[PDB]
């Protein structure tokens, strides 16, 4: 009588739970820094939706093991939006911030955010 | 012109990413044990879908600071299914294992699994 059952709302509920844990400052295990600005996160969450972060945290230049990692290559504002996306599946865009977000999304290999930025640009033009 | 966009596929892709990281043995930060059987996991994933694990890993219990935690009273077979559900949104049930899985889901407050066990048992009879 063996049968497999699925819970279609589970991935959404799990994502919401991850975001409430970050907001409560709980179980965090990395702080990414851009210049002097600090971005706390869960390595496993970022690794699960970006092959860039996955490579960084599961191999790496001895940064894989660090608790505080200086991130080069994107703007601080871009990184802020990308992390908030990882925990929410959403991004809030305007023409002032889209350069930062889109550049960061390409660099950090988060194609769904690239596509959302392109949708925004079609509408804003 | 300011607008929020969402990616409906993100929570599903993220869940899949978490599952592949557990399968590769990557970024794990807890081992639960039942009679010396080891169950590795990511605390933040278990905490994001069970109020029991969230209390254990974020609270003032002695367990909150332990990397290896003994789960007294809990079914080892049941725990296996519960953790696999956390990472997959699925459970595979039959009449041989369902009692273990239901009992562990109730104890560990994995509420969707309780419902799925009840649905299987209602169908089986």
Curated annotation (Swiss-Prot), chains A, B:
Gene that encodes the chain: KLHL26
Protein name as it appears in the record: Kelch-like protein 26
BTB domain boundaries: 28-95
Keywords from the UniProt entry: Acetylation, Kelch repeat, Repeat
Transmembrane segments annotated in the record for this chain: none
Highest taxon above the source species: Eukaryota
Residue span relative to the full protein: 36 to 160 of 615
Organism taxonomic ancestry: Eukaryota, Metazoa, Chordata, Craniata, Vertebrata
Disease: Defects in KLHL26 may be cause of autosomal dominant inheritance of Ebstein's anomaly and left ventricular non-compaction.
Function: May play a role in endo(sarco)plasmic reticulum (ER/SR) mitochondrial signaling. May be part of the ubiquitin-proteasome system (UPS) and affect ubiquitination and degradation of target substrates in cardiomyocytes.
Signal sequence coordinates: none
